[PDB]
Coordinates of C-alpha atoms and ligand atoms in Angstrom, one line a residue:
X935 CA -93.2 26.0 107.7
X936 CA -90.6 25.6 106.1
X937 CA -90.6 22.4 104.0
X938 CA -90.4 24.8 101.0
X939 CA -87.7 23.8 98.5
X940 CA -85.4 26.7 98.1
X941 CA -83.0 27.6 95.2
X942 CA -80.9 30.6 94.2
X943 CA -79.7 31.5 90.8
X944 CA -77.2 34.3 90.2
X945 CA -76.0 35.4 86.7
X946 CA -74.2 38.1 84.8
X947 CA -75.4 39.2 81.6
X948 CA -74.9 42.1 79.3
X949 CA -77.4 44.7 77.9
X950 CA -79.9 43.0 75.6
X951 CA -78.7 39.6 76.4
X952 CA -81.5 36.9 76.2
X953 CA -81.8 34.7 79.2
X954 CA -83.7 31.5 79.7
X955 CA -83.4 29.9 83.2
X956 CA -85.0 26.9 84.8
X957 CA -86.1 27.7 88.3
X958 CA -85.9 24.2 89.7
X959 CA -83.6 21.1 89.5
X960 CA -86.1 18.2 90.4
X961 CA -86.6 16.8 86.9
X962 CA -89.8 16.7 86.0
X963 CA -91.5 17.7 88.4
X964 CA -94.9 19.1 87.3
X965 CA -96.6 22.4 88.5
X966 CA -100.2 23.1 89.4
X967 CA -99.8 26.9 90.1
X968 CA -96.9 29.0 89.6
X969 CA -95.8 32.6 89.6
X970 CA -92.9 34.7 88.3
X971 CA -92.5 38.2 89.7
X972 CA -90.0 40.9 89.0
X973 CA -88.9 41.9 92.4
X974 CA -86.1 44.5 91.9
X975 CA -84.8 46.5 89.0
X976 CA -86.0 49.7 87.5
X977 CA -87.0 48.7 83.9
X978 CA -89.9 46.3 83.7
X979 CA -88.8 43.1 82.0
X980 CA -91.6 40.6 82.5
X981 CA -94.1 40.9 79.6
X982 CA -97.2 38.9 80.7
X983 CA -96.7 35.8 78.5
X984 CA -93.3 35.6 80.1
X985 CA -94.9 35.0 83.4
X986 CA -96.9 32.0 82.0
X987 CA -94.0 29.6 81.3
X988 CA -92.1 27.8 84.1
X989 CA -88.7 28.7 82.8
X990 CA -87.8 32.4 83.0
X991 CA -87.4 34.2 79.7
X992 CA -86.2 37.8 79.6
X993 CA -84.1 40.2 77.6
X994 CA -81.7 42.3 79.6
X995 CA -82.5 46.0 79.1
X996 CA -80.4 48.8 77.5
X997 CA -78.8 50.7 80.3
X998 CA -76.5 53.6 81.1
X999 CA -75.2 52.1 84.3
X1000 CA -74.9 48.5 85.5
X1001 CA -77.9 47.3 87.5
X1002 CA -79.2 44.2 89.3
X1003 CA -82.6 42.8 88.4
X1004 CA -84.5 40.3 90.6
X1005 CA -87.1 37.7 89.8
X1006 CA -88.9 35.4 92.3
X1007 CA -90.3 32.1 91.2
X1008 CA -93.0 30.3 93.3
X1009 CA -94.5 26.9 92.4
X1010 CA -96.7 24.2 93.8
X1011 CA -96.1 20.8 92.3
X1012 CA -98.8 18.2 91.6
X1013 CA -97.4 16.5 94.7
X1014 CA -98.2 19.3 96.0
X1015 CA -94.9 20.5 97.2
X1016 CA -93.9 24.2 97.5
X1017 CA -90.9 25.7 95.6
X1018 CA -89.4 29.1 95.8
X1019 CA -86.4 30.3 93.8
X1020 CA -84.7 33.7 93.9
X1021 CA -83.0 34.8 90.7
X1022 CA -80.5 37.7 90.4
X1023 CA -79.4 39.1 87.1
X1024 CA -76.3 41.3 87.3
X1025 CA -76.7 43.4 84.1
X1026 CA -73.3 44.9 83.0
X1027 CA -72.1 46.8 80.0
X1028 CA -71.1 44.8 77.0
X1029 CA -67.3 44.7 76.9
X1030 CA -64.4 44.0 74.5
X1031 CA -60.8 43.2 75.1
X1032 CA -58.4 43.4 72.1
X1033 CA -54.8 42.0 72.2
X1034 CA -52.3 42.4 69.4
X1035 CA -48.8 41.2 69.1
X1036 CA -46.5 39.4 66.6
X1037 CA -43.6 38.9 68.9
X1038 CA -43.1 36.8 72.1
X1039 CA -43.0 38.9 75.3
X1040 CA -46.2 41.0 74.8
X1041 CA -48.1 37.9 73.8
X1042 CA -47.0 36.0 76.9
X1043 CA -48.2 38.9 79.1
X1044 CA -51.5 39.3 77.2
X1045 CA -52.2 35.6 77.6
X1046 CA -51.8 35.9 81.4
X1047 CA -54.2 39.0 81.3
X1048 CA -56.8 36.9 79.4
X1049 CA -56.8 34.0 81.8
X1050 CA -57.1 36.4 84.8
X1051 CA -59.9 38.3 83.0
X1052 CA -61.9 35.2 82.2
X1053 CA -62.4 34.9 85.9
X1054 CA -62.9 38.7 86.8
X1055 CA -64.9 39.5 83.7
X1056 CA -66.8 36.4 82.4
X1057 CA -68.9 38.4 79.9
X1058 CA -66.1 40.2 78.2
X1059 CA -65.4 39.2 74.5
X1060 CA -61.8 38.7 73.6
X1061 CA -60.1 39.4 70.2
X1062 CA -56.5 38.4 69.6
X1063 CA -54.2 38.8 66.7
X1064 CA -51.1 36.8 67.7
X1065 CA -48.1 35.5 65.8
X1066 CA -46.5 33.0 68.2
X1067 CA -49.2 31.4 70.3
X1068 CA -52.2 29.7 68.8
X1069 CA -54.8 28.4 71.1
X1070 CA -57.0 25.5 70.0
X1071 CA -60.7 26.1 69.3
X1072 CA -61.4 24.5 72.7
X1073 CA -59.1 26.9 74.5
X1074 CA -60.5 29.9 72.6
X1075 CA -64.1 28.8 73.5
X1076 CA -63.0 28.5 77.1
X1077 CA -61.6 32.1 77.1
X1078 CA -64.2 33.7 74.8
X1079 CA -61.5 34.4 72.2
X1080 CA -62.0 35.1 68.5
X1081 CA -58.7 35.0 66.6
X1082 CA -57.5 37.1 63.7
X1083 CA -54.5 36.7 61.3
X1084 CA -51.9 39.4 61.5
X1085 CA -51.1 41.2 58.2
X1086 CA -47.5 42.5 58.1
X1087 CA -47.3 41.8 61.8
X1088 CA -50.1 44.2 62.7
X1089 CA -53.8 44.6 63.4
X1090 CA -55.6 43.2 60.3
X1091 CA -58.5 45.0 58.6
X1092 CA -60.8 42.2 59.5
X1093 CA -60.1 42.7 63.2
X1094 CA -60.9 46.4 62.9
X1095 CA -64.2 45.6 61.0
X1096 CA -65.2 43.2 63.7
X1097 CA -64.6 45.9 66.3
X1098 CA -66.6 48.4 64.3
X1099 CA -69.5 45.9 64.1
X1100 CA -69.5 45.7 67.9
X1101 CA -69.5 49.5 68.2
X1102 CA -72.5 49.6 65.8
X1103 CA -74.3 46.8 67.5
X1104 CA -73.9 47.2 71.2
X1105 CA -75.7 50.0 72.9
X1106 CA -72.9 50.9 75.3
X1107 CA -69.4 49.3 74.9
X1108 CA -66.4 49.1 77.2
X1109 CA -63.2 48.5 75.2
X1110 CA -59.7 47.5 76.6
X1111 CA -56.8 47.5 74.1
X1112 CA -53.4 45.8 74.4
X1113 CA -50.4 46.0 72.2
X1114 CA -46.7 45.4 71.7
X1115 CA -45.3 48.8 72.7
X1116 CA -42.8 49.5 69.9
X1117 CA -45.6 48.6 67.4
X1118 CA -48.5 50.3 69.2
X1119 CA -49.0 52.9 66.7
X1120 CA -49.7 50.6 63.7
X1121 CA -51.7 48.1 65.9
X1122 CA -53.9 50.7 67.7
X1123 CA -54.3 53.6 65.4
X1124 CA -56.5 51.9 62.9
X1125 CA -58.7 50.8 65.7
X1126 CA -58.8 54.1 67.5
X1127 CA -59.7 56.1 64.5
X1128 CA -62.8 54.0 63.8
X1129 CA -63.9 54.0 67.5
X1130 CA -63.2 57.7 67.8
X1131 CA -66.5 58.6 66.1
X1132 CA -68.5 56.2 68.3
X1133 CA -70.0 58.0 71.3
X1134 CA -71.3 54.8 72.8
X1135 CA -67.8 53.3 73.2
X1136 CA -65.5 53.9 76.1
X1137 CA -61.9 52.9 75.8
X1138 CA -61.3 52.2 79.4
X1139 CA -57.6 51.2 79.2
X1140 CA -54.7 50.7 76.9
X1141 CA -52.0 48.3 78.0
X1142 CA -48.5 48.5 76.5
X1143 CA -46.2 45.5 76.8
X1144 CA -42.6 45.8 75.5
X1145 CA -41.6 43.8 72.4
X1146 CA -38.5 43.2 74.6
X1147 CA -35.0 44.7 74.2
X1148 CA -36.2 46.5 71.0
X1149 CA -37.7 49.4 72.9
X1150 CA -34.6 49.8 75.0
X1151 CA -32.3 50.1 71.9
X1152 CA -34.7 52.8 70.7
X1153 CA -34.7 54.5 74.1
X1154 CA -30.9 54.3 74.2
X1155 CA -30.7 56.1 70.9
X1156 CA -33.4 58.5 72.0
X1157 CA -31.2 59.7 74.9
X1158 CA -29.6 62.0 72.3
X1159 CA -32.8 63.9 71.7
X1160 CA -32.6 67.7 72.2
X1161 CA -35.8 69.1 73.8
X1162 CA -37.2 65.8 74.7
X1163 CA -40.3 67.3 76.3
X1164 CA -41.0 69.4 73.2
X1165 CA -40.7 66.2 71.0
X1166 CA -43.1 64.3 73.2
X1167 CA -45.7 67.1 73.2
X1168 CA -45.5 67.3 69.4
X1169 CA -46.0 63.5 69.6
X1170 CA -49.3 63.9 71.5
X1171 CA -50.8 66.4 68.9
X1172 CA -49.6 64.3 66.1
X1173 CA -51.1 61.1 67.5
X1174 CA -54.3 63.0 68.4
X1175 CA -54.6 64.4 64.9
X1176 CA -54.0 61.0 63.3
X1177 CA -56.7 59.4 65.4
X1178 CA -59.1 62.3 64.7
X1179 CA -58.4 61.9 61.0
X1180 CA -57.2 65.6 60.8
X1181 CA -53.7 64.4 59.8
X1182 CA -53.3 61.8 57.1
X1183 CA -49.6 61.3 57.4
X1184 CA -49.6 58.1 59.5
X1185 CA -45.8 57.8 59.1
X1186 CA -44.2 58.8 62.5
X1187 CA -44.8 55.4 64.1
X1188 CA -41.8 55.6 66.4
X1189 CA -40.5 56.8 69.8
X1190 CA -42.2 60.2 70.2
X1191 CA -45.5 58.7 69.1
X1192 CA -45.4 55.5 71.2
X1193 CA -45.1 57.2 74.5
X1194 CA -48.2 59.4 74.3
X1195 CA -51.0 56.8 74.8
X1196 CA -51.3 58.0 78.5
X1197 CA -51.9 61.6 77.4
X1198 CA -55.0 60.6 75.4
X1199 CA -56.4 57.6 77.1
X1200 CA -56.3 55.8 80.4
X1201 CA -53.2 53.7 79.7
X1202 CA -50.5 51.6 81.4
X1203 CA -46.9 51.0 80.1
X1204 CA -45.6 47.7 81.4
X1205 CA -41.8 48.1 81.0
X1206 CA -39.6 45.0 80.8
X1207 CA -37.2 47.0 82.9
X1208 CA -38.8 50.1 84.3
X1209 CA -35.6 51.1 86.1
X1210 CA -34.0 51.9 82.8
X1211 CA -35.9 55.3 82.8
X1212 CA -34.1 56.1 86.1
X1213 CA -30.7 54.4 85.6
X1214 CA -30.3 56.7 82.5
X1215 CA -30.4 60.3 83.8
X1216 CA -31.2 61.7 80.3
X1217 CA -34.5 59.7 80.3
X1218 CA -35.8 61.2 83.6
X1219 CA -37.8 63.6 81.3
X1220 CA -39.5 60.6 79.6
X1221 CA -40.1 58.9 83.0
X1222 CA -41.7 62.2 84.2
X1223 CA -43.8 62.3 81.0
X1224 CA -45.2 58.8 81.4
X1225 CA -45.8 59.6 85.1
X1226 CA -48.1 57.3 86.9
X1227 CA -48.8 55.2 83.8
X1228 CA -45.2 53.8 84.1
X1229 CA -45.4 50.2 85.4
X1230 CA -42.9 47.4 85.9
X1231 CA -43.8 44.2 84.0
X1232 CA -44.9 41.6 86.5
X1233 CA -43.9 37.9 86.7
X1234 CA -46.3 36.7 89.4
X1235 CA -49.3 36.1 87.1
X1236 CA -48.7 32.4 87.0
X1237 CA -48.3 32.1 90.8
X1238 CA -51.5 34.1 91.3
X1239 CA -53.5 31.8 89.0
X1240 CA -55.6 29.0 90.6
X1241 CA -54.7 25.5 89.7
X1242 CA -57.2 25.2 86.8
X1243 CA -55.9 28.5 85.4
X1244 CA -52.2 27.3 85.7
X1245 CA -53.1 24.1 83.7
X1246 CA -54.9 26.0 81.1
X1247 CA -51.9 28.4 80.8
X1248 CA -49.3 25.7 80.5
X1249 CA -51.4 24.0 78.0
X1250 CA -51.8 27.1 75.8
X1251 CA -48.1 27.9 75.9
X1252 CA -47.4 24.1 75.2
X1253 CA -45.2 23.6 78.2
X1254 CA -45.2 20.0 79.5
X1255 CA -43.6 20.6 82.9
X1256 CA -43.6 17.0 84.1
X1257 CA -41.8 15.9 80.9
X1258 CA -39.0 18.4 81.4
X1259 CA -38.9 17.5 85.1
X1260 CA -38.5 13.8 84.1
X1261 CA -35.7 14.8 81.7
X1262 CA -33.9 16.8 84.4
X1263 CA -34.2 13.7 86.7
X1264 CA -32.9 11.2 84.9
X1265 CA -29.2 11.8 84.9
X1266 CA -26.8 12.5 87.8
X1267 CA -25.4 15.5 85.9
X1268 CA -26.5 19.1 86.7
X1269 CA -28.6 20.5 83.8
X1270 CA -27.5 23.2 81.4
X1271 CA -29.9 25.2 79.1
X1272 CA -28.4 27.0 76.2
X1273 CA -30.7 29.9 75.1
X1274 CA -30.5 30.6 71.3
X1275 CA -31.3 33.7 69.2
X1276 CA -32.6 34.4 65.7
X1277 CA -31.9 37.0 63.0
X1278 CA -34.7 39.5 62.0
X1279 CA -34.7 40.9 58.5
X1280 CA -31.5 38.8 57.6
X1281 CA -32.4 35.4 56.3
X1282 CA -29.1 35.4 54.4
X1283 CA -27.5 35.3 57.9
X1284 CA -29.1 32.3 59.5
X1285 CA -26.7 29.5 58.6
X1286 CA -23.9 31.7 60.0
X1287 CA -26.1 32.2 63.1
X1288 CA -26.5 28.4 63.5
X1289 CA -22.8 27.8 63.1
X1290 CA -21.9 30.5 65.7
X1291 CA -24.3 29.3 68.3
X1292 CA -23.0 25.7 67.9
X1293 CA -19.6 27.3 68.6
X1294 CA -21.0 29.0 71.7
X1295 CA -22.5 25.7 73.0
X1296 CA -19.1 24.1 72.3
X1297 CA -17.3 26.7 74.4
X1298 CA -19.5 25.9 77.4
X1299 CA -19.2 22.0 77.2
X1300 CA -15.6 21.7 76.0
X1301 CA -12.8 21.5 78.6
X1302 CA -10.3 23.2 76.2
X1303 CA -12.2 26.5 76.5
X1304 CA -12.0 29.2 79.2
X1305 CA -15.8 29.4 79.0
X1306 CA -16.2 25.8 80.1
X1307 CA -19.0 25.5 82.6
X1308 CA -16.5 23.7 85.0
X1309 CA -18.3 20.3 85.1
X1310 CA -20.2 17.9 82.8
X1311 CA -23.8 18.8 82.3
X1312 CA -26.9 17.4 80.6
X1313 CA -27.3 19.6 77.6
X1314 CA -30.7 21.4 77.0
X1315 CA -31.7 23.8 74.3
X1316 CA -34.2 26.7 74.1
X1317 CA -34.9 27.8 70.9
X1318 CA -35.6 31.2 70.0
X1319 CA -39.4 31.1 69.1
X1320 CA -38.5 32.7 65.7
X1321 CA -35.4 30.6 65.1
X1322 CA -36.8 28.4 62.4
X1323 CA -34.1 26.7 60.4
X1324 CA -31.5 28.0 63.0
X1325 CA -33.0 25.8 65.7
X1326 CA -33.1 22.7 63.5
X1327 CA -29.4 23.1 62.5
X1328 CA -28.4 23.5 66.1
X1329 CA -30.5 20.6 67.2
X1330 CA -29.1 18.1 64.7
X1331 CA -25.6 18.9 65.8
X1332 CA -26.3 17.3 69.2
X1333 CA -27.7 13.7 69.4
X1334 CA -27.8 14.0 72.9
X1335 CA -29.5 17.5 73.3
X1336 CA -33.0 17.9 74.8
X1337 CA -35.4 20.5 73.2
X1338 CA -37.3 22.7 75.3
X1339 CA -39.8 23.5 72.5
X1340 CA -38.7 26.8 71.1
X1341 CA -42.3 28.2 71.2
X1342 CA -42.3 28.3 75.0
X1343 CA -41.2 31.7 76.3
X1344 CA -38.3 31.0 78.6
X1345 CA -39.8 33.1 81.4
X1346 CA -42.5 30.4 81.8
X1347 CA -39.7 28.2 83.1
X1348 CA -38.9 30.9 85.6
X1349 CA -42.5 31.2 86.7
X1350 CA -42.9 27.5 87.0
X1351 CA -39.7 27.1 89.0
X1352 CA -38.2 25.0 86.2
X1353 CA -34.9 26.8 85.8
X1354 CA -32.0 24.4 85.3
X1355 CA -28.7 24.6 87.3
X1356 CA -27.0 26.7 84.6
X1357 CA -28.2 28.9 81.8
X1358 CA -26.0 30.6 79.2
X1359 CA -26.7 31.8 75.7
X1360 CA -27.1 34.7 73.3
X1361 CA -28.0 38.2 74.4
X1362 CA -31.8 38.3 74.6
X1363 CA -34.7 40.0 76.4
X1364 CA -34.9 36.9 78.5
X1365 CA -31.8 38.0 80.4
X1366 CA -33.5 41.3 81.3
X1367 CA -35.6 39.2 83.7
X1368 CA -33.9 35.8 84.6
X1369 CA -32.1 36.0 88.0
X1370 CA -28.4 36.8 87.8
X1371 CA -27.4 33.7 89.9
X1372 CA -28.6 31.3 87.2
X1373 CA -26.6 33.0 84.4
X1374 CA -23.2 31.5 83.5
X1375 CA -22.4 33.8 80.6
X1376 CA -24.0 35.8 77.9
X1377 CA -22.7 36.2 74.4
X1378 CA -23.4 39.0 71.9
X1379 CA -23.7 38.8 68.2
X1380 CA -20.9 39.5 65.6
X1381 CA -21.2 39.9 61.9
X1382 CA -18.8 38.1 59.4
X1383 CA -17.1 41.5 59.1
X1384 CA -16.0 43.6 62.1
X1385 CA -14.4 41.9 64.1
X1386 CA -13.1 45.0 66.0
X1387 CA -13.9 45.3 69.8
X1388 CA -14.0 49.0 70.7
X1389 CA -17.0 49.9 68.5
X1390 CA -18.6 46.5 68.8
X1391 CA -19.1 47.6 72.5
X1392 CA -20.8 50.6 71.1
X1393 CA -23.8 48.5 70.1
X1394 CA -27.0 49.8 71.9
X1395 CA -28.0 46.4 73.1
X1396 CA -24.6 46.0 74.7
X1397 CA -24.9 49.4 76.4
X1398 CA -28.5 48.7 77.6
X1399 CA -27.6 45.5 79.2
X1400 CA -24.5 46.9 80.9
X1401 CA -26.5 49.8 82.3
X1402 CA -29.1 47.4 83.6
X1403 CA -26.3 45.5 85.4
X1404 CA -26.9 42.4 83.5
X1405 CA -23.4 42.3 82.2
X1406 CA -20.2 44.1 83.0
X1407 CA -18.3 45.9 80.1
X1408 CA -14.9 44.4 80.8
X1409 CA -16.6 40.9 80.5
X1410 CA -18.8 41.4 77.5
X1411 CA -18.3 38.6 75.0
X1412 CA -18.9 38.7 71.2
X1413 CA -19.2 35.5 69.0
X1414 CA -15.9 36.4 67.4
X1415 CA -14.1 37.0 70.2
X1416 CA -14.6 33.4 71.2
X1417 CA -12.2 30.5 70.6
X1418 CA -13.0 28.3 67.7
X1419 CA -14.1 24.9 69.0
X1420 CA -15.2 23.4 65.7
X1421 CA -12.4 20.9 65.4
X1422 CA -13.0 19.5 68.9
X1423 CA -10.2 21.6 70.3
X1424 CA -10.9 25.2 71.3
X1425 CA -8.4 27.3 69.4
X1426 CA -8.0 31.0 70.3
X1427 CA -8.5 33.8 67.7
Ligands
LIG2302 O1 -38.9 41.0 68.5 C1 -39.7 40.8 67.4 C2 -39.2 41.5 66.1 O2 -40.0 41.1 65.0 C3 -39.6 41.7 63.8 O3 -40.5 41.2 62.8 C4 -40.2 39.9 62.2 C5 -41.2 38.9 62.7 O4 -41.2 38.7 64.0 C6 -41.2 37.6 61.9 O5 -42.2 36.8 62.3 C7 -41.2 37.9 60.4 O6 -42.3 38.6 60.0 O7 -40.0 38.7 60.1 C8 -40.2 40.0 60.6 C9 -39.1 40.9 59.9 O8 -38.2 41.5 60.7 C10 -39.8 43.2 63.8 O9 -39.5 43.7 62.6 C11 -39.0 43.8 65.0 O10 -39.3 45.2 65.1 C12 -39.3 43.0 66.3 O11 -40.6 43.4 66.7
C5P2303 N1 -34.0 31.5 73.4 C1 -35.0 32.3 73.6 C2 -35.0 33.6 73.1 C3 -36.2 34.4 73.3 N2 -37.2 33.9 74.0 C4 -38.4 34.7 74.2 O1 -38.5 35.8 73.4 C5 -38.5 37.1 74.1 C6 -37.7 38.1 73.4 O2 -36.4 37.6 73.3 P1 -35.3 38.2 72.3 O3 -34.8 39.4 73.0 O4 -34.3 37.1 72.2 O5 -36.0 38.3 70.9 C7 -37.9 36.6 75.4 O6 -38.3 37.4 76.5 C8 -38.4 35.2 75.6 O7 -39.8 35.3 75.9 C9 -37.2 32.6 74.4 O8 -38.1 32.1 75.1 N3 -36.1 31.8 74.2
MG2304 MG1 -47.2 36.6 69.1
MG2305 MG1 -28.9 59.0 80.3
MG2306 MG1 -30.0 15.6 85.4

């Protein structure tokens, strides 16, 4: 007439999911009549004793294609008021998203993918095996994450088993996979060779995010390859045979294997610096070969998040922005962030690494050095995520210094517009991305041996970083190379 009390419920809902929904929000509320009626949808879901309870109880059907189902509730209260509520169930394929990385860069990008996906795909389940970010149980619950411990930095057996159980248990399954690029082969292969025999599972996408500079060193060496295209095609058959189980030798985990995902699956390569495949003429073949799966890693994920998403993100990466802003604020002096490094597979080297980085910081803040920033600065430190005892040694050398928790990827400071006035430090993937104008100087690693300059410049990382226009050859600095500031006066070598 219409004093009929209307309500509308909309839900999404995977195959075989149980649903129990209250039609009304008036309390009690007590009904004389009602009726439940399936009103759209092809499979019949209302089983007669369903209809007789006031809350709606149904099991989503097994489907081949997503489909909407409709149910109309009508009631007359004892009062005797009329109610009508229209219910829509969007039934969608069960889906899985798997993300694996032991490093920093890929894990950061995967995090941003998860947060976006929690909005776009609420019913997706998410499995992570991460080394350097650990969400709380609350955060996991909020993002539908189950977590798994990396073994030898790679996909663990228990992650694979859990994926197998989903394949066995879900009637159709969409899977997305995401990995560290350099380490794809050991992260994804054990998963893909299980899933390969499951006809109900569709691998809809594989995302590859660069470890960082590591893949560029590899590509720099791989420039030498004769018959690149031949090697890559042999790469496809090899990878194909390994996943099919036809070939048992799972040993060629490197370059010619890692750039074939797109030949076997829908896949996207998110390059830290896509332009490297163009800047190096000899890699044009590889650029051709990756074709329209070649993407540039994006840094607008944070900006594109809504404000709740931005908070959840900062909270998961443990960045307290307001606290850093306070610290910036605070002193008259402009702010300087020194970015540190770590040694992989060289624990015997890390005290030497600490002592050298202390010397690099000293060069920046000591007037008796040509690398002097030019003014007094408040001193800030970032911490290599894997720096461990290197970070504590550097930290206790400076009373004085403010940490930037080392676990925070530096690019989140870029994305949050929390870059200081000056940044300098050790050669790192972070310099592949940070705007040139912020960089005061970059310093490359030296061993206790060389110290010779000509062949020091030969180092792949140096040649990458030159080619990318990050640094100019005539200005490359090596630790050793730099004046010794340890006594308080900077003395030339
Ligand atoms: O950029 C990350 C590099 O990690 C190296 O692995 C380290 C690992 O990160 C650390 O947590 C511990 O397990 O020591 C490992 C030994 O090197 C990889 O070896 C390297 O390839 C990079 O991915
Ligand atoms: N001082 C540093 C060094 C590295 N990192 C993080 O680790 C990633 C890989 O850096 P490296 O090339 O130094 O290993 C960087 O992109 C950045 O996310 C950092 O946040 N702070
Ligand atoms: Mg990690
Ligand atoms: Mg070239
Ligand atoms: Mg200040």
